[PDB]
Amino acid sequence: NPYERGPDPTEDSIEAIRGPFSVATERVSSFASGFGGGTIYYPRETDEGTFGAVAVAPGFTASQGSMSWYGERVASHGFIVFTIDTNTRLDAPGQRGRQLLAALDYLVERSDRKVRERLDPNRLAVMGHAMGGGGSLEATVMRPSLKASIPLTPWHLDKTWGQVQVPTFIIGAELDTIAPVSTHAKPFYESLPSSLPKAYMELCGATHFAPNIPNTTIAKYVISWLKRFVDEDTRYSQFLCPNPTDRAICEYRSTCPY
């Protein structure tokens, strides 16, 4: 696999706050086309090859600051991470989906040469919290060539997602009362195609805002999902299949094996 980066993983390595790569940043003006700008986190070391990229959207009435801890943590494992701001704080999930795509197109077409030279434009992914998680679902319908999708405590009014063909990892929060898992996260997961590589992880005692602070349970499996599907890195299947049994997880579902 020409896309494998970093040494062979252990459960300690995927739980490490800092991965094998050092990270630099690049700020993007809000006058970028089609989204509200943001911050690009990228691995500095270039001798292992180019990397895939993930655009990360915040929730309703939130900014990239609520998602900033994903920047260095995920990028240090070998990824370009773009925490974006939206055009307005009130943008809906469909709008956030379009803006995740515009952020990715920015990386491919308009980003700084330091980012462009490190990017593989064929291996892109989306992630989002709350309404941004609904935008992550929307973006996969809008661009089926995406490699992975991670809706974090997602909010969306539409409960059926049977046309998604992008591998999708939904994280729910047990005590979420803003986007309850019974009416958002779980219906979304169950409506994804039964043949799709997918998973649902519910966090014990977590609130709707659990994704907004550093969480090792979230981070270790976000890293494993992006490795498995953006990098085609089967070295990380061991952490995804069979279903994780971490104490912080109160329910896990998957279409393992993959």
Ligand X SMILES: COC(=O)c1ccc(P(=O)(O)OCCO)cc1
Report the candidate in 36, 80, 41, 65 with the shortest Cα–Cα distance to residue 231: 80
Region 132-191 residues binding ligand X, contact defined as CB under 6 A: 155, 178-179
Is the Cβ of residue 60 or residue 69 nearer to ligand X in the bound state?
A: 60
Residue 88 as a binder of ligand X (CB under 6 A): the answer is no
Nearer to ligand X, 178 or 241 (CB): 178
Q: How deeply is 235 buried, as exposed, middle or buried, from its count of CB atoms within 10 A (0-12, 13-18, 19+)?
A: middle
Interface region with ligand X, contact rule CB under 6 A, candidates 54-62, 108-116, 139-147, 197-205: 54-62
Using CB positions, name the residue nearest to ligand X.
59
Q: Are 215 and 234 in contact (CB under 8 A)?
A: no
Say if residues 38 and 83 touch (Cβ distance below 8 Å).
yes
CA atoms within 13 A on the CB side of 32: 27
Residue closer to ligand X, measured from CB, 28 or 130: 130
What is the nearest approach in angstroms of ligand X to the Cβ of residue 250? Answer: 20
Interaction mask 14-53, ligand X, x per CB under 6 A: ----------------------------------------
Can residue 92 be called a binding residue for ligand X (CB under 6 A)? no
Q: How far is the CB of 51 from ligand X (least distance, A)?
A: 28
Per-residue interface string for the shown chain with ligand X, residues 58-87, x marking contact by CB under 6 A: -xxxx-------------------------
Among the listed ranges 57-65, 103-111, 167-175, 197-205, the one in contact with ligand X (CB under 6 A) is 57-65
Question: Taking CB under 6 A as the rule, which mask of x and - marks residues 193-232 in contact with ligand X?
Answer: ----------------------------------------
Could you tell me how many residues of this chain bind ligand X (CB under 6 A)? 9
**Which residue in 40, 107, 131, 171 binds ligand X (CB under 6 A)?**
131
Angle, helices 131-142/93-109, rounded to nearest 10 degrees: 60
Q: How far is the CB of 180 from ligand X (least distance, A)?
A: 10
Note whether 56 binds ligand X by CB under 6 A.
no
Q: Does 100 bind ligand X (CB under 6 A)?
A: no
Nearer CB in complex with ligand X: 43/59: 59
Residue ranges that bind ligand X, judged by CB under 6 A: 59-62, 130-131, 155, 178-179
